[PDB]
Design a protein around this ligand. Sequence first.
Ligand SMILES: NC(=[NH2+])c1ccc(CNC(=O)[C@@H]2CCCN2C(=O)[C@H](N)Cc2ccccc2)cc1
Ligand SMILES: [Ca+2]
Length: 223
Amino acid sequence: IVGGYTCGANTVPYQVSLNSGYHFCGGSLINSQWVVSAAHCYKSGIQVRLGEDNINVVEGNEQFISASKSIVHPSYNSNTLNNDIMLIKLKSAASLNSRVASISLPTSCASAGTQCLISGWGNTKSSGTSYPDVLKCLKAPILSDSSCKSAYPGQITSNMFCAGYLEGGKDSCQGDSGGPVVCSGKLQGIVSWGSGCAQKNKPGVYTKVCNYVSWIKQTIASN
Ligand SMILES: NC(=[NH2+])c1ccc(CNC(=O)[C@@H]2CCCN2C(=O)[C@H](N)Cc2ccccc2)cc1
Ligand SMILES: [Ca+2]
């Protein structure tokens, strides 16, 4: 997260870190057994880390749970990141508490102009690299689809939306991949892609979760 702020420990209790020896992606807890992340975060051997603030220090509220299965969206395209969503099942149910909590799936999509909270442990620099160890947060509005497509002509599908600031300076970044965009209490986006980070006229692009709620609900009920 570039241009954001330190969230505060466990103030985003649905935020998970995906760990394969190191943090490599974010995700969102949607019930005690399931996490939503980005398909571009797919790999084997995932440990889900819940209750995290500083990902390099055991602070006392963590739950570390291995994934038992991962399900990449059936239509994910790795060349374009269309359908950039994946479900991860926990081998044992998380113990839900005020620091480890699920985020509600959208009943309805959100409209342009709605403010959202984006969070993660990704790079905080718009040029170069600095990775924080505590969770960072950013308030950012959904941008119009026309400004999104103007920024990225020929690349935006109906399964994507842009959010952030066309002037630059505030954005998500590498390492935030797969983490949440929460608007009005619903998981509306997943950190997906963009050109650089926090660059002028290059806003963040996010998987449009509301298009996937039927698939999520049917997939978790059958797995
Ligand atoms: N909001 C942002 N500026 C931002 C940008 C990037 C990321 C992390 N996501 C990435 O790094 C993804 C993974 C594959 C390549 N990639 C990218 O974002 C590429 N830079 C652009 C690209 C390549 C192929 C298809 C779609 C988009 C997270 C946030
Ligand atoms: Ca920790």
